[PDB]
A paper describes a structure:
The epidermal growth factor receptor (EGFR) is a receptor tyrosine kinase that couples the binding of extracellular ligands, such as EGF and transforming growth factor-α (TGF-α), to the initiation of intracellular signaling pathways. The extracellular module of EGFR consists of four domains, denoted Domains I, II, III, and IV. Domains I, II, and III form a compact unit that we refer to as the ligand-binding ‘head’, and Domain IV forms a rigid and elongated ‘leg’ that connects the ligand-binding head to the single transmembrane helix.
The activation loop is a key allosteric control element at the active site of the kinase domain, and the L834R mutation promotes the formation of the catalytically active asymmetric dimer of the kinase domains, leading to hyper-activation of EGFR. The overall structures of the tips-juxtaposed and tips-separated conformations of the EGFR(L834R):EGF complex are very similar to those seen for the corresponding complex of the wild-type receptor. When the rotational angle between the two heads is at its largest value (~25o), the two legs adopt similar conformations, and the membrane-proximal tips of the two legs are juxtaposed, with a separation of ~5 Å between the Cαatoms of the last residue in the legs (Thr 614) (the ‘juxtaposed’ conformation). For the tips-juxtaposed conformations, the cryo-EM densities are of comparable quality.
Residue numbers in the entry:
A (entry chain C), D (entry chain D): 5 to 51
B (entry chain A), C (entry chain B): 1 to 614
Write the structure that this text describes.
């Protein structure tokens, strides 16, 4: 769904998604990872 | 109680953290029972029938507030008082309420922020909310700062007409929600002419103090509801009280008996343990260029440079590395000869493959050795990926101190998660001045729970979390345990040079069972358990001590010549004495070197003067 | 209108200056058209029928006000607003009206101070005025601070009563004299608790700012009558705006776009050029013992000591020398090894003939030679007596700077009045950074009218009063004139070493007609009009010049041997080298120095082994 | 006038005078000199 410009923009195997209302792109981080583009691991609430 | 529960807040701007009911738990686990948000506040992606009643306790956001893409009918922010706008959403705003509608034109309908009375910076934005009621009437020039009012972009579209009219006792018909208490309490555009800031009424005897941010109860400086810049533990000043006051009469400085150190947005009696203390009386994180940090009487200070200041190194997330999120293959050279990373070190899995997004090439594993010269980190160390061929953290074999000034998620200071290393190998680490320690997920990592971390921690309250590493049954089975030649104090690996200690004697860095005073390699002598070799010309024996000191004044015997106290391979032939007098020594049956008669300066082979041959 | 005509105020305390008509004239010449008294206001011995109207201009006394032994029947101080009290009379009071009567019990009768609103510090004493009228009814608890009100001592004994009461439109009495305009206006014990300082009425909408001293005309800090602590050129601040502001968001120190240095009781943009600029941002007279002044890019500053500090030498009238008013033989021993006298210097004619009232012995005129090592004076130098034997200021021949930070009478920073010296002899004086210079009254002293003092002065607006010395033509006609080979700029005496700058060149501390180029005994060269001797190893050139610098590297020809670029007396024979290897050289044909052979240990008289035998 | 203790108190040829009202001692500085005990010359208004 996300164009070829935004590829690999989501780091941890999260699927990129395009928000039509705001005309911006965003991530769909897998559970366990946080951050703008799923970059950090959630150290607080798991290993 | 006296101190209010703080939380760190999100900032993952419009990212969804998993499923609809996995994102909500993350929203709940962060803002539950919180009362002061130290960062941002994202309430994105909350579907309806998700009871968001845990937000009625938040009383102050120190960043921005973003409420986007919800569908819940009511968001109870009924106690938010002030948005300090210390950072902006979309680089302009400090409160954005965007596209909160569902597919079928329904969505957010009640936002009763009836106590919000001040937005210290940034504008507001209210778009694409075709279900919002009663918020189309607020007077946003009582809340937003009068300077930032040219940037507000507020448009309301509620063609449904199913909204509510509100009680006549609201000022100019402006309510936050359907009711009588949701009237907007005005405190700035109704102030008397005399007032400088806020006012609890219209009569001129009501103006609040200059520093009160939202409102006040009384005209004092200890009656503000929320403060503006600082807080002197019962009141709130403009600047923390100076440490040394001036004197208009004597033209000199006087010691202020009520001085305080500024530490963030507070005035403290003394700075924290790991924070630089400037002479201004202020706890900073790293002092300016013209100075260089240095220890002084237990506490850390920083004095002026001796001249041109040495190589100063910045860490990720600060300085020019503001938006870089790992140690790229592009910014790796800027750490060439660093010895103190003023900042923090992130190592993420994107660095070792290279993202085509920011046009960054793949890193070369053997280029990490640049970091071998780092001897301290004034922030935290986040290691999240590492080359597979390696077995220990080889680039950090010289790290010694983690200051823990800035921390990850506000809590952690060391983090080694999900690697393939076999042993940490931080054998020179001796301090973690703040923050916790998490070493977990490393699938095969023994020796991780043999250290006694409480000797590295330099503060009380620091926990540690080691879980799900290699179990301490397969470590013992295979034989992955540290050398028997060490002590029960701890160990960073199997080699003797990997132990925090040595049970008998330490030959420099490693551990040995005995300093050889009787045979073998050139003899040594113990002192504080070390082994230091004898002077090169001391002769070893299968007998008592060969030497008890470094200097040549301690060899029991030397197989070469000797001049009294000290042995020399060949007694000196020109050494400077007193008044240009060179010392002239020669051979002897007693092996001791005597003074010739210098009247034949060509060196004597015998006593007197007939000994120098012709 | 940021200017108010200031004066200095007297400090005689009780002293009558001459006769009853010479005292009044000396009183009139100081408090004329003055608006702010920077010192103490003393009105003593003012006999009957004297026009004291010129006191209707004083608006603020920065010391104490003493009105004693007067007989004039009316002292108009109708515009005095504040008596701040930086110095007490009887070490307790700030205002004092002591015995103030004539012979037949008449005397001071009225004292309309109707604008006197606050005494910042101190108490009040009103004793033995038998003709005073209406001042017995004031409420002094509106003026004096409650902290000092336990020390007051009022004693009203007007046993004549021949004076009318005061208008019923005045608060139950409280009248400063006759009429309805001369009662008292209260501003501290009428208004309610909402006010923290003073006020303008009884409503809580009237409270003046905290930093208003007397009263106010508006609620904000730019409307105070008189400021309480500081003055930011239009407002009554509490501390001058800091030069650097803390940042609660990034834990660092910013810069302040409205920062100002605190100089006295004002906040200026930049310090005066002759003061010490501390790092906090403040003009001071001298900084703490932990530091020492340091010239830096034009301005003065002081950095931390390098280990042990130096001798801080207080001057007369500061620190331990506040009771001493001269350089009396008791304290002369303390200026034993001083270099900078951080203060004043008084030399009075009661130091040489001995004081009895303070049990001090006479000063031996030879004990003044201790000062010949002083080089700076961070104040003024008041010489008022010198031993009649001497003929010049010999003990100050090394003085180089007179900072003039504190000045005599607040005007002068050099006073050599009424000595018996022939010439000044300050031949090393180079700058008088501030304050006038008076050299006058000396019986037989010339050479003072030649120096162009406009060079030494380092500030615009410095005068010079040089009158009634030895006549111009009186000593010109007796050879007592500046020497021949000196620039016409001036001279401090007749000897060639006494002239500032030379006509041609100079040999150190003395002027000469020409450098020793070509001929002479020592060969020399010329740079900046100075004659420096050539390195001894420069062959005396009877033709052209000899050298072009100090070092042997400029020798046109070396006298003996030549070791490369340098001209040496004898080629090196034992100089330390690399790898601890000694160095031996030899002189060849052109007396050039070349290294020996690696094997030659005892040196060599020729190249290689074929040069050094046995 | 003044007791023998207050002798040499006044410096520049001034005369010590005793005030019977305040019960204190004061100087009578000659014309030209100022100060508590006539110690300073008046530089502003003469040479």
């Amino acid at each position: 769904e996300c164009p070829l410009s935004h590829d690999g923009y989501c780091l941890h195997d999260g699927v990129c998604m395009y928000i039509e209302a705001l005309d911006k792109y965003a991530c769909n981080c897998v559970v366990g990872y946080i951050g703008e583009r799923c970059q950090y691991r959630d150290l607080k609430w798991w290993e | 109680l006296e101190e209010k529960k703080v939380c760190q807040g999100t900032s993952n701007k419009l990212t969804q953290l998993g499923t609809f009911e996995d994102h909500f738990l993350s929203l709940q686990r962060m803002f539950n029972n919180c009362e002061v948000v130290l960062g941002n506040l994202e309430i994105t992606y909350v579907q309806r029938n998700y009871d968001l009643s845990f937000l009625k306790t938040i009383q102050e956001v120190a960043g921005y507030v973003l409420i986007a893409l919800n569908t819940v009918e009511r968001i109870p922010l009924e106690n938010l008082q002030i948005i300090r706008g210390n950072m902006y959403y979309e680089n302009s705003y400090a409160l954005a309420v965007l596209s909160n509608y569902d597919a079928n034109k329904t969505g957010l309908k009640e936002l009763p922020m009836r106590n919000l009375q001040e937005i210290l910076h940034g504008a507001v934005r209210f778009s694409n909310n075709p279900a919002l009621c009663n918020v189309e009437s607020i007077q946003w020039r009582d809340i937003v700062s009068s300077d930032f009012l040219s940037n507000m972009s507020m448009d309301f579209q509620n063609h449904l007409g199913s909204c509510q009219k509100c009680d006549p006792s609201c000022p100019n018909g402006s309510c936050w929600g359907a009711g009588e208490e949701n009237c907007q309490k005005l405190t700035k555009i109704i102030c008397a002419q005399q007032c400088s800031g806020r006012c609890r009424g219209k009569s001129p005897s009501d103006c609040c103090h200059n520093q009160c941010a939202a409102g006040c109860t009384g005209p004092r400086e200890s009656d503000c509801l929320v403060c503006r810049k600082f807080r002197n533990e019962a009141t709130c000043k403009d600047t923390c009280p100076p440490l040394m006051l001036y004197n208009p009469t004597t033209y000199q400085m006087d010691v202020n008996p009520e001085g305080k150190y500024s530490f963030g947005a507070t005035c403290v009696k003394k700075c924290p343990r790991n924070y630089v203390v400037t002479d201004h009386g202020s706890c900073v994180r790293a002092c300016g260029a013209d100075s260089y940090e240095m220890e002084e009487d237990g506490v850390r200070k920083c004095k002026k440079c001796e001249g041109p200041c040495r190589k100063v190194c910045n860490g990720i997330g600060i300085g020019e590395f503001k938006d870089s999120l790992s140690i790229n293959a592009t910014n790796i050279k800027h750490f060439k000869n660093c010895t103190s990373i003023s900042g923090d070190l992130h190592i993420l899995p994107v660095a070792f493959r290279g993202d085509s997004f920011t046009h960054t090439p793949p890193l070369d594993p053997q280029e990490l050795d640049i970091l071998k010269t780092v001897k301290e980190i004034t922030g935290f160390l986040l290691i999240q990926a590492w080359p597979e061929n390696r077995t220990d953290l080889h680039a950090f074999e010289n790290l010694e101190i983690i200051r823990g000034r800035t921390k990850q998620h506000g809590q952690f200071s060391l983090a080694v998660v999900s690697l393939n290393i076999t042993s940490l190998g931080l054998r020179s680490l001796k301090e973690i001045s703040d923050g916790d320690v998490i070493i977990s997920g490393n699938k095969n990592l023994c020796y991780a729970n043999t250290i006694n971390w409480k000797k590295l921690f330099g503060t009380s309250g620091q926990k540690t979390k080691i879980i799900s590493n290699r179990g301490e049954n397969s470590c013992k089975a295979t034989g992955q345990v540290c050398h028997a030649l060490c002590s029960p104090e701890g160990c960073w690996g199997p080699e003797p040079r990997d132990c925090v200690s040595c049970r008998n004697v330490s030959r420099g860095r490693e551990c040995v069972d005995k300093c050889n005073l009787l045979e073998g390699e050139p003899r040594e002598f113990v002192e504080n358990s070390e082994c230091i070799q004898c002077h090169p010309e001391c002769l070893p024996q299968a007998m008592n001590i060969t030497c008890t000191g470094r200097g040549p004044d301690n060899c029991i015997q030397c197989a070469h010549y000797i001049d009294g106290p000290h042995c020399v391979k060949t007694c000196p032939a020109g050494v400077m004495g007193e008044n240009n007098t060179l010392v002239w020594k020669y051979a002897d049956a007693g092996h001791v070197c005597h003074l010739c008669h210098p009247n034949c300066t060509y060196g004597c082979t015998g006593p007197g003067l007939e000994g120098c041959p012709t």
